[PDB]
């Protein structure tokens, strides 16, 4: 009715075009507008939303790492270092605004409209993820707030997935993967990270031993990532 | 040395190494030699043998599906069509050799040595499974016999399991799952398939330990998943 007058199907089609054109700001804006219509997202829409914002925030996370690295290597030039600081802070503000939009969506629409356990776990994990991205750049008491909020979202998703989902479920496995990254990178607890990741891998491989593995290709791919992260971590 | 001079413990150790190395043909060969010593298999030995052959035959089943899918996507070129047919026949011949080896182990050692009803149902289900895998690729001339042999083994397992085992037992549930797959996919009898799976599920749900609850519910969920896929 107002300034945005496309219906849901038009917005999804535009999101799909923007994804092909690698225009992820456009893609996220389209899927944000889809989400703000207030209806439960389909798996296809949920993936479009997730992929769009992963690319938008990921560009800032990448730039932040590069600039923060340069900022700490400039030993002499106080002016390259002051400009590097301001530019890092500009990127941080963008990152904080992107995470804010996602966390807004999760609390206003996505989590309250999740009734199946699989959907609750997916969005709580997403909440953990975006608070984790905020934790990557936060400081002081804001970091205390973001770290605790990330962990609480992950822990809640973790307990639901343990009670309601099989160890081979890709969403449960993806939660274990990202939660272990949280322990390793944010909490600096590599034993906790390695134990979570190996347990998830072990319980999945035990169940897959009983099943035909052809319909679980997406579980196997995440198990390979768990494998890879454990290889790097020890 | 050689398998015919190895103790069962050495062959099991070889099987566990082969499994870790993802060398499932080696794993099956070790457990085949264990089985051929003629002792009733322990639970651990049974698991190693079953996992080994599941993966050995499973590689060929997966390859056969891939090549079969390619064949119907290239039905307009003679040289590629005949290459696809010959390659599929090569895979079929490996699959048939694998299943015949398993079926020979079942008839000569596993089924005659099974002393408890649970073990008899397990190995009869396994006989039904491997005749089902033969049925998946069987020629027109052989299909009726392989399908009949699969059904007869599943049915004997089914009758014993209903007499001797709780509806909640995972082997009774697993038999029902795979027998219903047989009815749906091999016998093309979906009403009987759904009837079999629903009755099995509904019989277990009425009779629902925390550890016995966990194992039974996983297969019960698989029954639900197939029923959902089939009534869709």
């Amino acid at each position: 009715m107002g300034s945005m007058t496309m219906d849901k199907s038009e917005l999804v089609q535009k999101a799909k075009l923007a994804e092909q054109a690698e225009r992820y700001d456009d893609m996220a804006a389209a899927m944000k507008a889809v989400t703000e219509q207030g209806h439960e997202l389909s798996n296809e829409e949920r993936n479009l939303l997730s992929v769009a914002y992963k690319n938008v925030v990921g560009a800032r996370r990448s730039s932040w790492r590069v600039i923060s690295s340069i900022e700490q290597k400039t030993e002499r030039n106080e002016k390259k270092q002051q400009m590097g600081k301001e530019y890092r802070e500009k990127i941080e503000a963008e990152l904080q605004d992107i995470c804010n939009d996602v966390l807004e969506l999760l609390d206003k629409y996505l989590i309250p409209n999740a009734t199946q356990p699989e959907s609750k776990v997916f969005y709580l994990k997403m909440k953990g993820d975006y608070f984790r991205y905020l934790s990557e750049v936060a400081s002081g008491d804001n970091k205390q707030t973001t770290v605790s909020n990330s962990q609480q979202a992950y822990q809640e998703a973790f307990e639901i997935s343990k009670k309601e989902m099989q160890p081979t479920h890709p969403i449960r496995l993806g939660l274990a993967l990202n939660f272990s990254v949280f322990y390793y990178e944010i909490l600096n607890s590599p034993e906790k990270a390695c134990s979570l990741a190996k347990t998830a891998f072990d319980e999945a491989i035990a169940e897959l031993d009983t099943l035909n593995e052809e319909s679980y290709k997406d579980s196997t791919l995440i198990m390979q990532l768990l494998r890879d992260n454990l290889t790097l971590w020890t | 040395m050689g398998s015919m001079t190895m103790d069962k413990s050495e062959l099991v150790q070889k099987a566990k190494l082969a499994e870790q190395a993802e060398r499932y043909d080696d794993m099956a060969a070790a457990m085949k030699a264990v089985t051929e010593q003629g002792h009733e298999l322990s639970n651990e030995e049974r698991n190693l043998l079953s996992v080994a052959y599941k993966n050995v035959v499973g590689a060929r089943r997966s390859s056969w599906r891939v090549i079969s899918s390619i064949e119907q996507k290239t039905e307009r070129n003679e040289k590629k069509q005949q290459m696809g047919k010959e390659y599929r026949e090569k895979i079929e011949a490996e699959l048939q050799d694998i299943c015949n080896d398993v079926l020979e182990l079942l008839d000569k050692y596993l089924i005659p040595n099974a002393t408890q009803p649970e073990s008899k149902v397990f190995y009869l289900k396994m006989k039904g499974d491997y005749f089902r895998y033969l049925s998946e690729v069987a020629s027109g001339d052989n299909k009726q016999t392989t399908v009949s042999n699969s059904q007869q083994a599943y049915q004997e397992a089914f009758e014993i399991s209903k007499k001797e085992m709780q509806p909640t037992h995972p082997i009774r549930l697993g038999l029902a799952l795979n027998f219903s797959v047989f009815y749906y996919e091999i016998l093309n009898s979906p009403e009987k398939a759904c009837s079999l799976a629903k009755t099995a599920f509904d019989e277990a749900i009425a009779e629902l330990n925390e550890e016995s609850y966990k194992d039974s519910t996983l297969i019960m969920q698989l029954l639900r998943d197939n029923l959902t896929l089939w009534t869709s």
Binding site: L177, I222, L225 | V51, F122, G174
Partner: peptide, 16 residues
Amino acid sequence: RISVIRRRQSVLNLMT
């Protein structure tokens, strides 16, 4: 490190 965003079922019984 990495972070991330059918067919009928048959079963093999692996009793422990």
